[PDB]
Write a protein that binds this DNA or RNA. Structure first.
Ligand code: NA
Ligand code: NA
Length: 327
DNA sequence: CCGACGGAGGAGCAGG
DNA sequence: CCTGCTCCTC
DNA sequence: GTCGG
């Protein structure tokens, strides 16, 4: 489906999804609009009526009449009303700052704070995460081309190995699927001395090392198993400096590693279909484990995983390269 | 009509 | 001073 | 909001 096929409908749906998530605080309506927006973005026809799209799974009654109004008028009275509503469109924008969710964006707006400059003039009311998110507001919305993502992986792998050569570090996300651009770098990390029962400064030593070589610049949150922070590639001679990028590093036990590697590689749709055969054939998948069913349904014990396709094999799927796990 | 819709690690303070 | 849940992210 | 009980 081309850039201008049902793009008017899909943009409007995701715009409704954003309003529901940020303003209404209805993550399930938000996921519902995203689902209908996704299934229409794979529909190989131009829609002429709401009932035409309602055949698709995820599109129902209320969305069909929203599609019907859009076709007739090229707009939606409600959606256009939401745009011009100063307090709703303010809550929407403020959530684009990392660390400002739907709950904090309303507090800011009700006490008059509605812009970045308003936030920069009220640093006292921001926590550490939100001060960083405000600082790199422009950088964090930029995409990361693959060439820079691979240079970023060069540093991560090089410094990870030089702390302990038995660390296993895998960069996941769309980058692992050959995507020409990413939004952030996701790092999955494990060590043979950490299992479901296991000197776990392991995440700390890795984070510290990338800080000393000045890859990591800021810390949004840091704990035993999960790191979220900011990084930046070094600048070359007199050329302008690279934008700061979001990076997360997780320490997963060695047994649950390839479940996590599978899950955090995506795509989620690809996980929604793969998740949805496992149960078809008697297995339940989550981020951590593959577990057998379950003649009523409820299950017991996690099984051994030593490779990503170890999971593919019990489900009995020809291993799919990350190259083609778009769905 | 009603319940499910992914879910957990980490940060952090209003109430008393 | 003590308590302990909401928020955010991906 | 939608789907499935
Ligand atoms: Na439908
Ligand atoms: Na945000």
């Amino acid at each position: 489906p081309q850039e201008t096929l049902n793009g008017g409908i899909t943009d409007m749906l995701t715009e409704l999804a954003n309003f529901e998530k940020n303003v209404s605080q209805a993550i399930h309506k938000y996921n519902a609009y995203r689902k209908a927006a996704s299934v229409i973005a794979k529909y190989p026809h131009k829609i002429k009526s709401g009932a035409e799209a309602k055949k698709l799974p995820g599109v129902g009654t209320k969305i069909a009449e929203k599609i019907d109004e859009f076709l007739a008028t090229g707009k939606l009275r409600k959606l256009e009303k939401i745009r011009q509503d100063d307090t709703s469109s303010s809550i929407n924008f403020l959530t684009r700052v990392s660390g400002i969710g739907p709950s904090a964006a309303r507090k800011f707006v009700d006490e008059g704070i509605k812009t970045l400059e308003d936030l920069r003039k009220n640093e006292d009311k921001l926590n550490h995460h939100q001060r960083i998110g405000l600082k790199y507001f422009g950088d964090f919305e930029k995409r990361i081309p693959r060439e820079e993502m691979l240079q970023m992986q060069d540093i991560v792998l090089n410094e990870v190995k030089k702390v302990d050569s038995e660390y296993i570090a895998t960069v996941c996300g769309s980058f692992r699927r050959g995507a020409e651009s990413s939004g952030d770098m996701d790092v999955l990390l494990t060590h043979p001395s950490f299992t479901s029962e296991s000197q776990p400064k392991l995440l700390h030593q890795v984070v510290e090392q990338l800080q000393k070589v000045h890859f990591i610049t800021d810390t949004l949150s840091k704990g035993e198993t999960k790191f979220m922070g900011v990084c930046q590639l070094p600048s070359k001679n007199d050329e302008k400096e690279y934008p700061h990028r979001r990076i997360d590093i997780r320490l997963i036990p060695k047994d649950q590693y390839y479940c996590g590697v599978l899950y955090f590689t995506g795509s989620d749709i690809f996980n929604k279909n793969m998740r949805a055969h496992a149960l078809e054939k008697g297995f339940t998948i989550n981020e951590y484990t593959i577990r057998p069913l379950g003649v009523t349904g409820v299950a017991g014990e996690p099984l051994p995983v030593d490779s990503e396709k170890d999971i593919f094999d019990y489900i009995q799927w020809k291993y799919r390269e990350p190259k083609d796990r778009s769905e």
